[PDB]
Amino acid sequence: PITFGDFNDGEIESLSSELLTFGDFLPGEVDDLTDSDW
Amino acid sequence: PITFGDFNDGEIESLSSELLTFGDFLPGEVDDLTDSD
Amino acid sequence: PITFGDFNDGEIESLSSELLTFGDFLPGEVDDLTDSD
Amino acid sequence: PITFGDFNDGEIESLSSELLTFGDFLPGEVDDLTDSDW
Amino acid sequence: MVMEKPSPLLVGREFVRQYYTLLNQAPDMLHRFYGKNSSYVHGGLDSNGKPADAVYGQKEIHRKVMSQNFTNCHTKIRHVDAHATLNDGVVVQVMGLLSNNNQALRRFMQTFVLAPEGSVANKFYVHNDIFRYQDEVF
Amino acid sequence: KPSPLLVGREFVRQYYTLLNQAPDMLHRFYGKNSSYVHGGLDSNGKPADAVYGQKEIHRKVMSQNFTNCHTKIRHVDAHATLNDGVVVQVMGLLSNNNQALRRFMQTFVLAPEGSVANKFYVHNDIFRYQDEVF
Amino acid sequence: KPSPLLVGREFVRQYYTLLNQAPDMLHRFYGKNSSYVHGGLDSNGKPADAVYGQKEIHRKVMSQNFTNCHTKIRHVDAHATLNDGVVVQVMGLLSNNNQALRRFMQTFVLAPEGSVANKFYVHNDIFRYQDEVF
Amino acid sequence: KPSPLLVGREFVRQYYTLLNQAPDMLHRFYGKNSSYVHGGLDSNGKPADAVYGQKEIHRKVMSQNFTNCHTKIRHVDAHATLNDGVVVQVMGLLSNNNQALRRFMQTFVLAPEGSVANKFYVHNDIFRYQDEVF
Amino acid sequence: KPSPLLVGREFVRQYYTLLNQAPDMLHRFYGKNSSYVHGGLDSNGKPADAVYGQKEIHRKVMSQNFTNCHTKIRHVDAHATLNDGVVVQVMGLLSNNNQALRRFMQTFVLAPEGSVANKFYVHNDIFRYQDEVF
Amino acid sequence: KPSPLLVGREFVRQYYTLLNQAPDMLHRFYGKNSSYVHGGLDSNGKPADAVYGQKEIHRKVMSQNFTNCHTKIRHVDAHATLNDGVVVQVMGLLSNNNQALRRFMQTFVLAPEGSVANKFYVHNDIFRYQDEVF
Amino acid sequence: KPSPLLVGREFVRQYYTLLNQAPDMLHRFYGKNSSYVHGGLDSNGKPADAVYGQKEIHRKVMSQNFTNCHTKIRHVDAHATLNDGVVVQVMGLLSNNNQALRRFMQTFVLAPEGSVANKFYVHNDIFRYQDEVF
Amino acid sequence: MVMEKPSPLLVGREFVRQYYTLLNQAPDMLHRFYGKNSSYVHGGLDSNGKPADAVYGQKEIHRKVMSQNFTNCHTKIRHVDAHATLNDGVVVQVMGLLSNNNQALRRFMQTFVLAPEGSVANKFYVHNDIFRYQDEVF
């Protein structure tokens, strides 16, 4: 349980662990519609 | 035997091999694909 | 109180700090070691 | 036993492994005499 | 290992890739990209000679998107250029070729404006979409 | 039998034209069990692992997102290698999406086919940028 | 008691992650008597003096207005110091608002909180762009 | 004594095929005291300076680095000139790096080599696009 | 069967050790049928063509006259190839006669002897200094 | 009580004069359990193992073998730190044996002594060139 | 009114103490419309250019980068110029970067600021090493 | 890990370090740095006013080394410059300060020539040593 500053444990990864997302599609839920291709 | 510069008859005509293909592409299919597109 | 530029009274005099020492040296022995060989 | 060319295994090592030495002082014997301070 | 956040250029390129891949594969799901106040115009031509107007919503843009059959569409992107704009939004400029129903590829020019959804970090929706074939205008 | 220089030059031309025009059709240059790096770097800041198999090569090629990928060929050297193969070293510049041109090198190993003569499938494709290492 | 190397590495990645993503809460790193300097120049060209205090650090951060700071950490070296504190020496490239990367040199000094185990705060922050002072 | 029209056609087909195929071996067409002037590269590209000799001609050709330059010849005019020379004026559409077709004029003045009969070398080579002038 | 990555790394180490420790026996790495080019220029400016044959390779090495060449291997990448061969792509800095370092790009192709296990010979050697061609 | 800036500047002057004159006498600057990570490259190349204690510090200094090591102090920053310590970051140029000047950073953590006031011993000394990293 | 000799002596001791101790704030002795000519190098070391203003004066002083400079003052002459200004001409030995002691002259022309009595700023500063002439 | 047999500059610097450390501690072993054809002169002054001549061997160089009774010698190298020469040898040029028996530091110049032994790789011996104090010359 290593923390820096006054930040709560895991708050740093909570804030920074947001994958790049577009529209209403979930992350990784737009590449699945285009499998089974060449 | 009309050649130019340091050329004799044979070199660039053999250097233009239209029969050579790569992958499953049909001969010239890649060329046409690039041209007019 | 004669000073030059923006200097007030004796800020450079405090800067001097001849009594500052580091390590095991006696005050000023490093200076004496280097200036005159 | 990975080899290249007509070099025996370890031929390159034996050849290129000698360390820089001076006079006849075996590499290192000068270090002890040298560090004879405290 | 530093996570950072995506740059506007990378965000725009990813959106272009995602948009055109989804359009090529599952056009019916395209409506998920837009939002409540999302304006959309896609190379339209009314029965007058002037380019068609734009839709301004969700249900009617979905209706338009079904109105264009949009089957086996092949897209070929020649130019994607993105930049940051107001409210962390990204303005994107796209040029390339588009072909629907396996017709001849026609030159298209498009402008996207993506805006953040707000509640979810790193989530963008297509606030604005302006697409025109430069064959029914030029 | 054509010159190794001939095969290398023709393949370089075809590859770096098809890369600009139709990058999605690059997967048809390789064959089964062919190595294709081109990663440059990965999530852990290391040269990407090779992807084998036409499906994997196509997936990685599409992930690279080549848009108007301009190529500036400075040098192409072709030599004959084992099993009537050709080894091609291509050095030059590359610019994706009309960005700044970056120095690159690429090694192609093209294996032939006992069936069809004068047909080559790229057995090895290794790509690297100059800036990512220097 | 974790290794100071790991402590410094984790702090470095967290600090630059927050310096890019959410620069508003960067001040939460520092403490009451913390010092901060991030490479400014006065009228005469002398590098800007450091500021002290958490609130003054927050003010200086806002004045710097870091917008989408892309950073590449070339080297980090963390080591033990007084009161189990850690000194971190970082070298790398940083660019705000997506202009070109600028070479930077940095020193962090982190002190334990003495109340919560494995807790650190930035006692000292020294940052200098290379081109500014060299 | 080959026909001037015949030698003009032979040279135009040979030169453009080699240019599309092997831009590196383009210098072979020239020799000593040969003037090569093209579109021109500079800080702005407007000043198109003539270069002489195989050394400079190859350097300039490689600097222009034609890649898969597709040429569609629309017209060729060959005529006789002094020293039994041949002057060739060519119209066509040139697309370099898979750009759009652009109209151009290439005027060649070919001189006989003297030693070998029916041998010519490019003594003067003036290239000028259409869009950049008009 | 050792990994091609280790095979290429070991060969790179040995080759760049013998480049300066004993360039006399560099030819022992090459086989009878082997291509070699090490970044030469001719009068016309085109890069020097490769030589073939072990004896010609040795003569070319002697003409190059490597004197205490210093190497810094920035990157090396080896992968599998025909007949369990290995293709190695290396990027680095080479300094000749203690002079300034020069950037270089190289490709080795190593083919197994087929006589004894884990023995390779340099089928192909393509070396190119960056400044000479770029 | 002297200013942290004063102590840092005086120590910088004394250190970079004694380094030039009597490098063997640098061992006295430090004390028990003091880190001295000045170094270049190792088997891994990037990280240098710290040496603790005057014994290892003097041994490492003699290994570095400074001769007429000229120092070019571009900038010095000094701030207060734990237990009334001083953290000083000094950036500049270094030239050993009258060679090419190389950009460098050094971080000192001047720790005080409880027995006698105004005394200081270097608890942490971290040195890193610029070229070895970028 | 202070004595011209007294103010000359005070300025010389203060100025050389500042130069030896903290060269960074050496510019504080000057102001606006002050001329500073002090050796220097343009391309060969011979072209010496005067600089004006605190900006340029500090930049030139930092370019010179005096490190530990022991200035042994041999002689000082102070006199009364116009409008109650003071002219100082100083002889001494200057050793920069712990190099050999070299003779020099430094002629100062000091002007009163006007607001605060017994306050002067360096209006003109002409320095010349004796071993540059003769 | 390229082995990369050492450059002449590094070889010369290592030799200088080893020489002026061994001389500082055990100057008796100094004889081991030379060979049969080693010429050596070390800032000598004969009973004439002219600089002393040079020894040309091993036994007499040992004798000479004991003759100047080197002890508690403090040496500070100010400049070392090494270059390659004939037969893979290295020519080394050194300047600095030397004090013997705890006297005052003396300005000194020196020129070494190191040659390979021949049998053992990366082994050198001092073929030539020319050392002079400036005051005995200037």
Residue numbers in the entry:
A (entry chain K), D (entry chain W): 472 to 509
B (entry chain X), C (entry chain J): 472 to 508
E (entry chain G), L (entry chain R): 1 to 138
F (entry chain T), G (entry chain F), H (entry chain M), I (entry chain S), J (entry chain E), K (entry chain D): 5 to 138
Show me the paper's own sentences about this structure.
The interaction between CHIKV nsP3 and host G3BP1 is critical for viral replication. G3BP1 plays a key role in the assembly and dynamics of host stress granules (SGs). Old World alphaviruses, including Semliki Forest virus (SFV) and CHIKV, have also evolved ways to prevent SG formation by viral nsP3 binding to G3BP1 (24, 39, 40). The NTF2L domain of G3BP1 has been verified to bind to various partners through the FGxF (Phe–Gly–x–Phe; x: Asp, Glu, or Ser) motif.
CHIKV-43 interacts with the NTF2L domain to form a high-order oligomer within a double-layer ring scaffold. Totally, three continuous yet distinguishable conformations (referred to as Conformations I, II, and III) of the CHIKV-43–NTF2L complex were identified, accounting for 49.1%, 32.9%, and 18.0% of the total particles, respectively. Conformation I represents an intermediate state between Conformations II and III. These three conformations could interconvert to each other in solution. To investigate the cause of the slight conformational changes, we compared the NTF2Ls and CHIKV-43 peptides across three conformations. The structures of NTF2Ls remain consistent in all conformations (e.g., chains A and B). However, the flexible loops between α1 and motif 2 in the CHIKV-43 peptides exhibit conformational variability. This suggests that the CHIKV-43 peptide may drive the observed differences. Whether these conformational changes have any biological significance requires further investigation.
